[PDB]
Structure formats: structure tokens, C-alpha cells
Structure 1
Amino acid sequence: SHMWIGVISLFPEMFKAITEFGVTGRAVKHNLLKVECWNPRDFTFDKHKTVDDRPYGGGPGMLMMVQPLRDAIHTAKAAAGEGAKVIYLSPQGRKLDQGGVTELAQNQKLILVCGRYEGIDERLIQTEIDEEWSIGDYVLTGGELPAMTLIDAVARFIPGVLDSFADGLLDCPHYTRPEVLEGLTVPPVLMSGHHEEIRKWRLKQSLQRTWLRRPELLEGLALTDEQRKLLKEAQAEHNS
């Protein structure tokens, strides 16, 4: 299947980072993922193509100018046609996690609005935006990196395009050549050829790492009997 993403951005060339390189670049070249961009600057009418505006109430910073941004959004909505969810990237939005990625990946079309400066007029959020999403509790200069983050995370769910959080757990450690690196050996179980011992080792590692690093993640999980056993074993070894 295929996903279409419309993007509204003052810096559409930023999106080459995902459309020209790696797994996502190959998805775009093979038409599994389509990304189309509209730039508010192209919707300005004044001589200097002004895309910012002063905030009412004074104070510092500038906002994106309403008219060019609104017009861009309307053009993208017309292109997307029916059924396209419009998302504004913002640190005030729903914090993205793998559950949220799986929800978003159920959409065949999304339009992603990328802010710049201090953001966008609150009434455009009310009138044009369906959902606000954050990539994390930190502030960036623009919504393009968050949009690309979202695109990359969802694109991994597109069939044909290709884990931590997959089953709620951090990933296990991985090893490749050489067998010994600075005196550190690959765990012998991984060279044993024993698929079931390997499976159990990787799962116990994931449990152990999640417990030590992110114990709060473990709370939200309903572990299988095997997972409970392997976790107890890891905790007992840690104590020992």
C-alpha cells in the first residue's frame, strides 16, 4: 500500500533529507510514499514575499503570517481531496510514541503543517488543524524536523519499505564481526546456532534493559508467563 503526505513549509528543500536518502528515499523513488510540498512564500503578494507578522500583545518574536499560510493549507487540502487529516507539529501537541505512530500509519493521506518563528495563529489551529502532535518535550526552531520524524516513523509501516517499543520493550543488544573486539567477546549463545536459546536470550536482554533503563515502561505491560520468568531470572542475576 501507499501513503501520501502533503507538507506546508517555508523550507521545503529540508525534506530532501528523507526523500533522497536511505530507506525513506527508496520508498519515495518507488512510489510507496509520496511527499508533496507547498511553501507559504509562494502564496504572498507583496514585493518582498513577507511570511511573518507581529504578535498582538507585543513581546518578542514573530508569528507566521496568516494569509500566505492559510492559502497554502487550502491548496494542500484541495490536492489531498477527501479524508486527509491535517496535523500541526507543535510541542503543545500529543507526544509521539510508537502507539501514536501506529495510529497515524492507519491514514492513507496526511497533511503536515510546519511552524517557524514563534508558531502560528491560534485561530488557524481551531479552523484548519485536526490534530496537534509533538515529537517530544523540547523546543525546536521549526516543524520540519518533527514532520520528517513523523514521516520516517510511519513510513516504516508501509509494506515493502523495509524493535524497541514494538512489544513495549527496548531492543536487545546486537553483535557483528569481529568475534572479539577490544577484549570483549560476543556472547557464546549467539554463536551456538541454537535458535530457541537465542530467542530466549534476546527476550531476557530486552526485559533486563527495559527494567534497568525504563522501568516505567514495564509497568504498562502485561507480560507473558515466559516474559515474567525471564525478567525474574534477570533481576535475580542482577542481585547476585
Structure 2
Amino acid sequence: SHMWIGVISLFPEMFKAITEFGVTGRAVKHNLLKVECWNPRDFTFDKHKTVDDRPYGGGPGMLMMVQPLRDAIHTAKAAAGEGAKVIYLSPQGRKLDQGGVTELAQNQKLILVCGRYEGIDERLIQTEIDEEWSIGDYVLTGGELPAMTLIDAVARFIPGVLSFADGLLDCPHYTRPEVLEGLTVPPVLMSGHHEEIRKWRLKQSLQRTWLRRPELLEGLALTDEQRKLLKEAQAEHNSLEHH
């Protein structure tokens, strides 16, 4: 495979969501993407396979038990070999974005640590984790969805598996029928004029980015064409009434 991803999770079966369906599922079956899981519960030794533990200092909630998680991590690292970057999914980590995705996609091996409960021991992060990554400024019940989100995002960059390409939102899309609930497809898209169609899409993208996410434009160095199309959109916007 072009990319191998080790996963530490109490719920390995959750990953079937990406390994068994759609383009990512195809990628896995075709060995372009390999996802291997290790479950901390399999590394417990007590009768009830305990995987959580009490946080020092008290407070509500529990934490992942260190020993089972630590052993699971070590086993994954042994299976990965040298060169594998170990990531902990966490809202305290670097916020994921397309730029970060392409950066992570450069790794041929990754080990993703998925926490549950209130998280994991800080010392494990310092001694076992290379990088902490967040998929957004919100809190989820576990690191599994965040891990799958990361895998799915990077997988798109793996040759053969298959917006923001120019740091812009995508343009609107249209398919059959020509008229839907009285709404028609923009005439230009049905003209067959490749060049005009190209410009329409770029202009729409610039317009939509300007109107919905103006901040995204600030950190962007526009080409002469982009500057022109944007100015046209803004001029057209300024010649209209608005709600």
C-alpha cells in the first residue's frame, strides 16, 4: 500500500465506516490504503478487562487506563517499524485544514491514537505522541470519528484513490433536469463554451468565498485573472439590491 495507518482504539469496528464503503473502502480493498487496529482492551490483564481509570485530583469523568493503552501503542509502533509518526486526536491539538491534510499525506506510515472518556494521561502524550491534531473547535465523545476524518482527508491525496485547491470555496454545481422547481441551470453551463465555463466557475468560487468566508481571501495571493474576476463579481454585487 502507498499509505499504512495504525489505529489504537477501544472500538476497532467503527473504522468499517471508511474501510467498507465508498472510495475509501475501494482504496482499502485495492491495497492503496491499509488500516490496522489495536484495541487496548486486548492488552488488559484483569478479569474484567478494565480500560479506564480515575484521574488524579478527582473531578468527574475517567481517563484511559495507562498500561493497556501504552502497551497497545508499543505494539503498533513495533508493527509499524521506523518512520511512523504517532498522532493523538485531540481538541487541544493543531486544527486540521487542507494545508495540514496535504502535510500529513506526505507520511507513508501513521499511528492514530483514539481516546475516550476525558482523554489520556499527559505523560503518555509527552513520551509516546509526536503530534496532537484536532478536526475542529468542538468536543466529540471519542477520537475515532476525528481519526476517520483525518484518514479520509489524506486518502484523497493517495494516487489512484480518486475545493480549497486554490484556497477557495467551490462553485455551485448543476445536473439534470434543466429546470428544477422553476429554477433553470445557468445558461452558460449549457453553452458548451469551455473557456467561458472555466471563468464562470472561477468567478463563482471567488464570489462565494468573498461573501461567505472573506477571511480566506486575506491570506491569499490572487493571480491577475482571479483579481479581475473578483472585482467583476463585487461590481455586479454592488449594482444589485440586497436583503
TM-score (norm 2): 0.98
Structure 1 position 180, deviation (Å): 0.3
CA distance in 2, matches of 1:24, 1:204: 31
Give secondary structure in 2 for the equivalent of 1:107: coil
Task: Give the total of aligned pairs.
Answer: 239
CA distance in 1, matches of 2:123, 2:60: 20
Give secondary structure in 1 for the equivalent of 2:201: helix
Structure 1 position 21, deviation (Å): 0.2
Structure 1 position 185, deviation (Å): 0.4
Structure 1 position 83, deviation (Å): 0.1
- 1:73 aligns to what? 73
Q: Which runs of 5+ in 1 are unaligned?
A: none
Residue by residue over 1:79-121, the C-alpha shift from the partner in whole angstroms, topping out at 9 and shown as x without a partner, is 0001000000000000000000000000000000000000000
- The alignment's C-alpha RMSD in Å is 0.5
CA distance in 2, matches of 1:136, 1:85: 21
Residue by residue over 1:41-65, the C-alpha shift from the partner in whole angstroms, topping out at 9 and shown as x without a partner, is 0000000000000000001000000
CA distance in 1, matches of 2:189, 2:146: 37
Give secondary structure in 1 for the equivalent of 2:206: helix
CA distance in 2, matches of 1:146, 1:68: 21
Structure 1 position 166, deviation (Å): 1.0
Structure 1 position 140, deviation (Å): 0.1
Residue by residue over 1:178-205, the C-alpha shift from the partner in whole angstroms, topping out at 9 and shown as x without a partner, is 0000011000000000000000000000
CA distance in 1, matches of 2:171, 2:65: 47
CA distance in 1, matches of 2:187, 2:159: 35
Structure 1 position 158, deviation (Å): 0.5
- 1:230 aligns to what? 229
CA distance in 1, matches of 2:16, 2:179: 39
CA distance in 2, matches of 1:45, 1:51: 10
Give secondary structure in 2 for the equivalent of 1:70: helix
Structure 1 position 131, deviation (Å): 0.1
Q: Which runs of 5+ in 2 are unaligned?
A: none
CA distance in 2, matches of 1:146, 1:93: 12
CA distance in 1, matches of 2:46, 2:164: 48
Structure 1 position 165, deviation (Å): 1.0
Give secondary structure in 1 for the equivalent of 2:4: strand
Residue by residue over 1:117-169, the C-alpha shift from the partner in whole angstroms, topping out at 9 and shown as x without a partner, is 0000000000000000000000000000000000000000010001x211100
Give secondary structure in 2 for the equivalent of 1:50: coil
Structure 1 position 213, deviation (Å): 0.3
Residue by residue over 1:62-84, the C-alpha shift from the partner in whole angstroms, topping out at 9 and shown as x without a partner, is 00000000000000000000100
Structure 1 position 222, deviation (Å): 0.2
CA distance in 2, matches of 1:58, 1:111: 30
Give secondary structure in 1 for the equivalent of 2:35: strand
Structure 2 residue 69 is matched with structure 1 residue 39: no
Give secondary structure in 2 for the equivalent of 1:196: helix
TM-score (norm 1): 0.99
Structure 2 residue 203 is matched with structure 1 residue 212: no
Residue by residue over 1:196-229, the C-alpha shift from the partner in whole angstroms, topping out at 9 and shown as x without a partner, is 0000000000000000000000000000000000
- 1:157 aligns to what? 157
**Percent of pairs with identical residues:** 100
Structure 1 position 36, deviation (Å): 0.1
Give secondary structure in 2 for the equivalent of 1:90: strand
